[PDB]
Amino acid sequence: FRNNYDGDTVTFSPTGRLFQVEYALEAIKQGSVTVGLRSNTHAVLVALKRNADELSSYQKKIIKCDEHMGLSLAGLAPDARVLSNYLRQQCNYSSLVFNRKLAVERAGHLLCDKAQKNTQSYGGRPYGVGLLIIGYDKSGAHLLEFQPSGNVTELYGTAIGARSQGAKTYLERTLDTFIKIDGNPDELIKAGVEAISQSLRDESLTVDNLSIAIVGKDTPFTIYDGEAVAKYI
Amino acid sequence: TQQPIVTGTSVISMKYDNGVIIAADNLGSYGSLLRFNGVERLIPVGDNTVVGISGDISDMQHIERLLKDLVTENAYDNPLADAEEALEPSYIFEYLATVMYQRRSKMNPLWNAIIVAGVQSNGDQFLRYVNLLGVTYSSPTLATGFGAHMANPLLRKVVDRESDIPKTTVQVAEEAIVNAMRVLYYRDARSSRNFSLAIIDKNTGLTFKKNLQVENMKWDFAKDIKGYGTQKI
Structure with missing residues (x-):
């Protein structure tokens, strides 16, 4: 079965499945946990950074796409660099050409469509990374979940x-x-750390191990790492 | 590089306390032949923006088509197209400005002079100019071609600087602009007596007046004038 229908993204299995896409989704599960949540004034990203050795750094998991948008990644880091870079260009385009900040919902649609192309043609491979996008636009705070399948919610x-x-x-x-944690970032962030620690098991979130990012009403997407997150551990 | 063929003359405008006014006659000249008389050179975009165009008419019609598409495109996958995510006047302008400059940079311009008038979502007045060279600027009053020489001086006697805006009412403003249209009919050899006028008020919305006419002209003194110096009869 499967073995005969998983050699490339251009093949449907007898049940209508796309194994290459599914195998890609597997890379995400093997990735370190990351969380996202929003109130009506802010959106927060809490991500557990993973280290190779105790002599190695904890790989960055949050990327800023614009002053009002950013995301967290789980899976193949290189693929997040590509996708975030594309999101950076799309935000830049909206600004330069229409002097308009890109709607978080629109960014989601753009990511979905870019991911989809890599699941219908011979030669390519699906992206092997999951993304959580947060941002404050003309309709408030937003949080999006991006899956390599091309599904964004x-x-x-x-x-x-x-x-x-x-x-x-x-x-x-x-x-x-x-x-309802409106107008109080610290409370939202703490709630984020409390949700993320619900997925711990190995260790406990430390200072050079925890990574947090926030955006909102009067808060440009900013990233906090190390000492800066100490007051949350 | 091209040369205009069918052209539209002046486009005058100014801003008042609650919004902006903009006008343009209904003529499409062909050199010295006043060929077409039912030409509308004021393009409304949504209900907070009016784009006034002068110059080559074939290019104007092309800008028209571009504007209709912008509206269609903005609606796509946009549940807020008629709310928080509708087209702002500044978006319309930045788009056009972008196009005008790209076209001049490719040595194939859209032979026009454009004035984008409207009210931003937060109530602010919007009045900016862009032309075939991609040059842009803002001023309490703006006019293209002939109206730049004759309309601006009049309109500026009402709103000389920014602080005069809040002191100018729709009545005073519409009056200034209607008088300017008469003066232009007096001294501009490529003008028509019929014209369209539009008001974009942050309270009353967009009011588009068609088929106006220059009225209350002074010609009687013409009878007292004979010869060109010494002739008596």
């Missing part, structure tokens, strides 16, 4: 990566609570 919160299910249930529970 808008949510109040979510998590992707290994053991992500922990944080996801926590948020699906804490919903009514954090969705």
